[PDB]
Amino acid sequence: KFTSNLTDLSIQVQEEVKLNINKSYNEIMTVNNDLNVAMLELKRVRANINDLNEVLDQCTKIAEKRLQLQDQIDQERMRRDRSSVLILEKFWDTELDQLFKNVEGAQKFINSTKGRHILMNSANWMELNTTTGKPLQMVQIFILNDLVLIADKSRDKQNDFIVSQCYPLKDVT
Amino acid sequence: FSEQVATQEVIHSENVIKLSKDLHTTLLTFDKLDDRLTNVTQVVSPLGDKLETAIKKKQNYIQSVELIRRYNDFYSMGKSDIVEQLRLSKNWKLNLKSVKLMKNLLILSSKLETSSIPKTINTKLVIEKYSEMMENELLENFNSAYRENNFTKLNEIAIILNNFNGGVNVIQSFINQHDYFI
Amino acid sequence: MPAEIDIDEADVLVLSQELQKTSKLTFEINKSLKKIAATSNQSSQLFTPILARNNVLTTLQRNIESTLNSVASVKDLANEASKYEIILQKGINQVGLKQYTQVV
Amino acid sequence: KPFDPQINITKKMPFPYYEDQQLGALSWILDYFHGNSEGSIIQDILVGERSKLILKCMAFLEPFAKEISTAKNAPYEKGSSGMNSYTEALLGFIANEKSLVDDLYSQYTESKPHVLSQILSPLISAYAKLFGANLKIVRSNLENFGFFSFELVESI
Amino acid sequence: VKHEPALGQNDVFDLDPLSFDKWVPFLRRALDKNQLDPVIDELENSIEDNFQGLELQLLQDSQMNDKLETSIDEIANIQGMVQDTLSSEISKFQIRLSESANELIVKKQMY
């Protein structure tokens, strides 16, 4: 009779613990499966966040390394006030990354490519036919540092060689 | 004068000084970051370790049974289209053309070595075509005829029929359903 | 250079905009423990009772399945042990992994 | 099986890696042999298996690296013996040694790098030997062969 | 879980399970006569899905269970340390952005 209890309680053990615990690991370890993918890709982009600790909490600590390299310089022992490159070099390499925001926007190169450190604004001015007062075609307004690109980017969806109503800012009125 | 140079003194000196101190403390923070990340994925070895257990004989049983009712279709006699969808559920909704007409053509495409050669794949694709025509009337009933169903009856019943594609035939059944007045 | 002399507010506040981009990295960090630790709490509570049911196997069905033969008789073990001189003398690859090793 | 590891350097091919048809039965047989506690024994046997197989494949590349065939041509004179590829496949089979050996675990196990000592300390002695061989053909004369020593530096 | 999809007929590719798709259907049933003589071998492949299926079913719930303990326990303690590290990151941009606008405010005083 205890062997009958082995058939009942132990068929419940193998059959019911295997099938019921098969539901526990099937559904619940399916939640651990998809949630394991969640913490998996979260671990990957978390390692990209650790890369951002190198890409920002070390890169701006490289900016801080130049900063306390200049307070570490402290070479007055007033004309050593050029303590930044990122006053020129990374500031016109950041503003030459506005020649890469320019060169991306193109946004000269096309053939001016001189000085848009602050390529200071862009707008969406659908232009007007100035005589009749009706509308003209649309135009991106590319107000660079010292030259204007009133460019009809239609149907020039780039922003590579768009219609450049252009001049220099020093006599733009 | 030294108001401006006082901005150079406090701002430059304190900015450089607490820039190095706060950024170095931030480097200690990044040390705790990779610490917890290393202990995290190191604790996440049991994830993959348990995750090898995806015993896809379930896939061999839905696939073996897919071969089975596929052969029920492939007797040219798969009349198991419970009417006609089956109604309100065949996967969760109308799936007589979803799991089966795509198995009428894709299991018409299921060539083992010879396996009921292209005499059978054509008329099996004509079961994909009859169930495709009733599928067109089905999602047409879902969204083109209703056309009053702001609920899932247009939305998640044709989108329950979103294993079938080509919804600009349904927009064709919007210039023939909703712009039919137009 | 020729006119850019006020670069501290713009390159440094742009570096503070980069620190505002690194404040967006702190949104990636609060997002990091948010999404990742959310998967931790969610899968954690999601599979703790899976460890209670795997524990129901691993405590109750474990020593229950062990003490099946708590008393078990004398001749029958010779019978089916001799039938494991049938099956254990079929080789490994005929019999199979937990077939062979579980008969062991 | 044995093979020239240069064939996996000439053709640059990925190194042999056992797989799960074994490995489930392998680790199963291991912790199975930690109920039986003889996983240490079959472990030391396995150190036998792969250690000797590295003596087989690395018995192929004993040939072109025991002999540094450029003795005194200019003196040095080519940069072109085979202790480089010797040490190359030595480290790469140290690599798939490291992975493929230290895969198969119920994760916490003590002797896993001690296994790596059991397999590679003789191969440490193998590099120490052929390190001896090129250490003495590049010996007894500065500029024998004296610049070529730097590639030995490379290898070490 | 990971089942109950449409799956018909994804990867058409009849998989030749015991080559019963190859033997009965694709070698004695080549031109759509059979599968009626082969449909018996398909139901026989369903009994083989109960014996192959029972065989894999034995090995299905077989690997258990010791322990994946610090999966849950280190998920808990590492989750609390994840909370404290998140406090270190929010604190990090707290004092960091505090200094950024602080000396960008004294640097706006340099403006």
Q: What is the 3-state secondary structure (H, E, C) of chain B?
A: CCCHHHHHHHHHHHHHHHHHHHHHHHHHHHHHHHHHHHHHHHHCHHHHHHHCCCCCCHHHHHHHHHHHHHHHHHHHHCCCCCCCCCCCCCCCCCCCCCCCHHHHHCCCCCCCCCCCCCHHHHHHHHHHHHHHHHHHHHHHHHHHCCCCCCCCCCHHHHCCCCCCCCCHHHHHCCCCCCCCCC
Q: b/e for E44-53, b at 16 or more Cβ within 10 A?
A: ebbebbeebb
The DSSP secondary structure of chain C, one letter per residue, reads --S---HHHHHHHHHHHHHHHHHHHHHHHHHHHHHHHHHHHHHHHHHHHHHHHHHIIIIIIHHHHHGGGSS--SHHHHHHHHHHHHHGGG-STTT-HHHHHHH-
CA distances, A103 to each of A96, B81, C31 (Å): 9, 61, 33
Contact (Cβ atoms closer than 8 angstroms) between residue A115 and residue A146: yes
Q: How far is it, in rounded angstroms, from Cα A119 to Cα A98?
A: 7
Both tokens assigned to B131: 């169930």
How many beta-carbon contacts under 8 Å exist across B and E?
A: 183
- State the Cα–Cα distance between residues C38 and C44, nearest whole angstrom: 9
* Phi, psi at A164, each rounded to 5°: -90, 90
Chain breaks in chain A (C to N over 2.5 A) after: 77
Tell me how far apart the alpha carbons of residues C62 and C57 are, in angstroms, rounded to a whole number.
6
Mutate to test the interface with E, among B99, B112, B119, B135 (most CBs of E within 10 A): B112
**Residue D80 DSSP one-character state:** -
Burial, E105: exposed, middle or buried (Cβ in 10 Å; 0-12, 13-18, 19+)? middle
CB B91 within 8 A of CB B98: yes
Q: B59: which 2 tokens? A: 């896939």
Cis preceding-peptide flag for B84 (omega within 30 of 0): yes
Rounded Cα distance, B51 and A29, in Å: 8
CA distance C6 to chain A (A): 8
Judging contacts by C-beta atoms under 8 Å, the chain B residues touching residue C36 are 40
Strand partners, A143: A121, A148
H or E segment to which residue A108 belongs: none
**Placement of tokens 């009053």 in the chain:** B148
Looking up tokens 């024994």, which residue turns up? D41
At residue C39, what is the residue type?
Answer: T
- Of the candidates A50, A54, A71, the beta carbon closest to that of B17 is on A71
Cβ contact B98:B161 at 8 Å? yes
The answer to whether A122 touches A142, Cβ cutoff 8 Å, is yes
Radius of gyration of chain C (CA): 33
Q: Bin D108: left if φ > 0, else alpha if -120 < ψ < 50, else beta.
A: beta
Task: Please tell me the distance from the alpha carbon of residue E34 to that of residue B114, in angstroms, as a whole number.
Answer: 12
Instruction: Give, in order, the Cα–Cα distances in Å from C73 to each of C68, C76, C79, C86, E41.
Output: 12, 6, 11, 20, 44
The SS3 of residue D140 is: coil
HSE (side-chain half, CA atoms, 13 Å) at D66: 8
Answer for the pair B119, E32: CB distance below 8 angstroms, yes or no: yes
The residue among A57, A65, A70 with the most chain B CBs within 10 A of its CB, best to mutate, is A57
How is residue A15 annotated by DSSP?
I
**C7-55 and A60-70 helices, crossing angle to 10°:** 140
Task: For residue E49, give the nearest of E17, E25, E79 by alpha carbon.
Answer: E17
Smallest Cβ–Cβ distance between B19 and the set A47, A54, A68 belongs to A68
Whether A149 and A164 have beta carbons less than 8 Å apart is answered as yes
- Report which of A124, A130, A120, A80 is spatially closest to residue A98, judged by C-alpha positions: A120
B77 to chain C, any CB pair closer than 8 A? The answer is no
Q: What is the 3-state secondary structure (H, E, C) of C28-52?
A: HHHHHHHHHHHHHHHHHHHHHHHHH
Q: How far is E61 from chain A (nearest CA, A)?
A: 6
Are A90 and A66 in contact by the 8 Å Cβ rule? The answer is no
Whether E61 sits inside 8 A of A18 (CB atoms) is: yes
Rounded distance between C-alpha atoms, residue A139 and residue A148, angstroms: 12
- State the distance between the two ends of chain D, measured CA to CA, in whole angstroms: 28
Amino acid at C54: N
Q: Residue A60 in contact with residue E100, Cβ under 8 Å?
A: no
Residue type, B179: D
Question: What's the rounded Cα separation, in Å, for the pair A64 and B25?
Answer: 12
Q: How far is the alpha carbon of D29 from chain C, nearest alpha carbon, in Å? A: 8
Pair of tokens at residue A155: 């149907």
Q: How many CB atoms lie within 10 A of CB B3?
A: 8
Separation CA A49–CA C31 (nearest Å): 10
Distance CA E25, CA E16 (A): 10
CA distance A88 to A91: 5
CA C8 – CA A91 distance, rounded (Å): 10
Q: In the structure encoding, which two tokens stand for residue A133, read together?
A: 């007062």
Distance, in Å, from the CA atom of B133 to the CA atom of B129, rounded to the nearest integer, reads 6
Contact partners, residue C44, CB within 8 Å, separation at least 6: E72, E75, E76, E79
Chains that touch C (3 or more CB pairs under 8 A): A, B, D, E
Q: How far is E52 from chain B (nearest CA, A)?
A: 9
> Is there a contact between A71 and B44 if contact means CB atoms under 8 Å apart?
no
DSSP string, D12-62: -PPPP---HHHHHHHHHHHHHHHHSSTHHHHHHHHHHHHHHHHHHHHHHTS
CA B12, B16, B19, B24: dihedral to nearest 10 degrees? Answer: -170
Of D141, D136, D138, D137, the C-alpha closest to D149 is D138
* Token duo for residue B60: 């061999």
Closest CA to B97 of B71, B73, B117, B68: B73
- On the 0-12 / 13-18 / 19+ scale of CB atoms within 10 A, B12 is buried
Say what the resolution is, in angstroms.
4.4
- How far apart, in whole angstroms, are the C-alpha atoms of residue D136 and residue E65? 57
Contact A109, A103 (CB under 8 A): yes
Residue C35 backbone dihedrals phi, psi, to 5 degrees: -70, -45
End-to-end alpha carbon distance in chain B: 78
With touching defined as 3+ CB pairs under 8 A, do chains C and E touch?
A: yes
Sign of CA dihedral D93, D95, D98, D100: negative
- Experimental technique for the deposited model: cryo-EM
Q: Are strands A135-143 and A147-152 parallel, antiparallel or unpaired?
A: antiparallel
Judge whether B10 is closer than 8 Å to chain A, CB to CB: no
State CA A55 to chain mean position distance: 12
Q: Note whether D131 and D156 are within 8 A (CB).
A: yes
Residue of E nearest to C98 (CA): E59
* Strand, coil or helix: A83: coil
The structure tokens listed for E31 are 């031109």
**Cβ pair E29:B116 closer than 8 A:** yes
Report the residue count for chain C.
104
C9: nearest CA partner in chain B: B11
Cross-chain Cβ contact A27/E1 below 8 Å:
yes
Sorted by sequence, the CB contacts under 8 Å of residue C36 that are 6+ apart come out as A38, A39, A42, A43, A46, B40, E82
Q: How far is CA E66 from CA B84, D35, D106, in A?
A: 50, 13, 10
| Sheet strands side by side (includes A135-143) | A121-128, A135-143, A147-152, A163-168
| Distance from the Cα of residue B55 to its chain's centroid | 22
| HSE-CB of E68 using CA atoms within 13 angstroms | 26
What residue in B sits closest to A37 (Cα-Cα)?
B47
Instruction: Confirm or reject contact between E30 and chain C (CB < 8 A).
Output: no
For residue B157 the two structure tokens come to 């019943």
DSSP collapsed to 3 states, D91-102? HHHHHHHHHHHH
The minimum CA-CA distance between C101 and chain D, rounded to whole Å, is 8
Cα–Cα distance measured from residue A94 to residue C15, given in angstroms and rounded to the nearest whole number: 10
Structure-token pair, residue E78: 């590492």
Nearest-Cα residue of chain D relative to residue B42: D107
Determine the distance in angstroms separating the CA of E24 from the nearest CA of chain A, rounded to an integer. Answer: 34
**CB-based contact (8 Å) between C101 and chain E?**
no
Q: What angle do CA C95, C99, C103 make, to 5 degrees?
A: 110
- Classify the C-alpha dihedral B88-B93-B94-B96 as positive or negative: negative
In 3D space, the residue among A167, D108, E108 whose CA is nearest the CA of residue E100 turns out to be E108
CA–CA separation, D156 vs D149, rounded Å?
A: 10
Asked whether the CA dihedral A27, A32, A33, A38 is positive or negative, the reply is: positive
Q: Considering CB atoms only, which of C8, C19, C29 is closest to E89?
A: C29
Helix pair angle (D83-103, D39-60), 10° resolution: 160
Min Cα–Cα distance to chain B from A10, Å: 24
- Chains A and D: 3 or more CB pairs within 8 Å of each other: no
Report the b/e string of D20-38 with b at 16+ CB within 10 A. eeeebbbbbbbebeeeeee
Six token digits for residue C98? 């937990």
Show the tokens assigned to A160.
């590579």
Compute the radius of gyration of chain B from its Cα atoms: 31
Distance CA C45, CA C50 (A): 9
Q: How far is CA D67 from CA A136, B24, D136, E38, in A?
A: 83, 53, 11, 67
B5 touches chain C (CB under 8 A): no
Tokens, residue C8: 């501290």
Chains in contact with chain D (at least 3 beta-carbon pairs closer than 8 A): B, C
Residue among A56, A61, A78 with most chain B CBs within 10 A, to mutate:
A61
What's the token pair of residue C50?
Answer: 């899976």
What is chain E's Cα-based Rg? 31
Q: Tokens at residue A14, please?
A: 């193998």
Q: To the nearest whole angstrom, how far is the Cα of D39 from the nearest Cα of chain C?
A: 15
- List, as one string, the DSSP characters of chain E: -------TTSS-S---TTSHHHHHHHHSSTTSS-SSHHHHHHHHHHHHHHHHHHHHHHHHT-S--S--HHHHHHHHHHHHHHHHHHHHHHHHHHHHHHHHHHHTTSSSS--
From the list B16, B24, B27, which residue is nearest A67 (CB)? Answer: B16
Name which of A53, B20, C15 is nearest E88 in CA terms: A53
Is B57–E45 a contact, with Cβ atoms under 8 angstroms apart?
no
Asked if E37 has any chain B CB less than 8 Å from its own CB, the reply is no
Instruction: Please list every residue in chain B whose beta carbon sits closer than 8 Å to the beta carbon of residue E17.
Output: 60, 64
Instruction: Report the chain C residue with the minimal C-alpha distance to residue B16.
Output: C12
Contact B44 A46 (CB under 8 A): no
Bridge partners of A152, per DSSP, are: A163
Question: Shortest CA distance to A152 belongs to which of A166, A142, A140, A160?
Answer: A140
| Closest CB to C7 among A42, A57, A91 | A91
Handedness of CA D123, D127, D133, D135 (dihedral sign): negative
CB count in 10 Å sphere of residue D95: 12
SS3 state at A148 = strand
Question: How far is residue A100 CA from its own chain's centroid?
Answer: 14
Please tell me the distance in Å from E74's CA to the nearest CA on chain C.
10
* Strand partners of residue A123: A141
